[PDB]
């Protein structure tokens, strides 16, 4: 699988081509994103549950 790295500022993203993606929510192993920064601007804004 290919996943974009979450960014901390509003960026300009190039249009990308994707083909694969699952059918359920198999995302439980994700802990947090941009932990060291103040906020996630573009990517998946995951936070500690």
């Amino acid at each position: 699988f290919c996943i974009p790295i979450p960014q901390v500022y509003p960026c300009i993203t190039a249009r990308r081509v994707h083909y694969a993606f699952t059918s359920e929510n198999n995302n439980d192993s994700l802990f947090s994103t941009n932990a060291a920064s103040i906020d996630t601007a573009f990517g998946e804004n995951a936070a500690v549950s």
Binding site: I12, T13, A14, R15, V17
Partner: protein
């Protein structure tokens, strides 16, 4: 039979002045791979590849 009377110097200078590059390189280019793989070629009848 053919001939070619060369164009005037003035208009040539103007034309050559305005010539943007037709192939510019930038990181955000919307890349798309070929639909059919150009590497291998398959015999459509006996499926022999080359």
């Amino acid at each position: 039979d053919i001939i070619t009377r060369p164009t005037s110097d003035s208009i040539a200078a103007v034309a050559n002045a305005t010539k943007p590059a037709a192939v510019v390189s930038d990181p955000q280019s919307m890349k798309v791979t070929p639909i059919v793989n150009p590497s291998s070629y398959v015999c459509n009848v006996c499926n022999a590849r080359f």
